[PDB]
Amino acid sequence: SSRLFRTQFRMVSPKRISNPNNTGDSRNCRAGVQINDSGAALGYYVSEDGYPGW
Amino acid sequence: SMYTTAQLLAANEQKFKFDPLFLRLFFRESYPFTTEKVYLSQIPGLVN
């Protein structure tokens, strides 16, 4: 960015967030949302959508 | 009845060595399936 602000936001469809490679849900990683010992969430697995078909 | 006394010092539980290396290295994902059978497919992929 040559402009003054370098912050940009990108919308994400909820369909993209899921487990990597469509694996079964483990104790700490449920539906692409990683969980610590508590109920909090640390990080999310976001895939890439391919219109060509794969 | 019995007048003897004893004290226990060391208690150990021996464990035989075991480490699932092949699961750790290669098979890294699980696919629980509710159906009766599982299909695995291949495709030749030889183009002249």
From Swiss-Prot, chain A:
It comes from the Viruses. Homododecamer. Interacts with the terminase complex composed of two small and one large terminase subunits. The gene is B. Belongs to the siphoviridae portal protein family. The chain holds residues 161 to 214 of 533 of the full protein. Transmembrane segments: none annotated. Proteolytically cleaved by the viral protease during capsid maturation. It comes from Escherichia phage lambda. It is found in: Virion. Forms the portal vertex of the capsid. This portal plays critical roles in head assembly, genome packaging, neck/tail attachment, and genome ejection. The portal protein multimerizes as a single ring-shaped homododecamer arranged around a central channel. Binds to the terminase subunits to form the packaging machine. Coiled coil: none annotated. This is Portal protein B.
Swiss-Prot record, chain B:
It is found in: Virion; Host cytoplasm. Homomultimer. Interacts with FI protein. Assembles to form an icosahedral capsid with a T=7 symmetry. The icosahedral capsid is about 60 nm in diameter and composed of 415 major capsid proteins. The assembly is primed by the interaction between capsid assembly protease and portal dodecamer, and major capsid proteins assemble cooperatively to form the procapsid with the help of capsid scaffolding protein. Major capsid protein forms hexons and pentons of the icosahedron. Viral genomic DNA is packaged into the procapsid through the portal vertex. Belongs to the lambda phage major capsid protein family. It comes from Escherichia phage lambda. It comes from the Viruses. The chain holds residues 2 to 49 of 341 of the full protein. This is Major capsid protein.
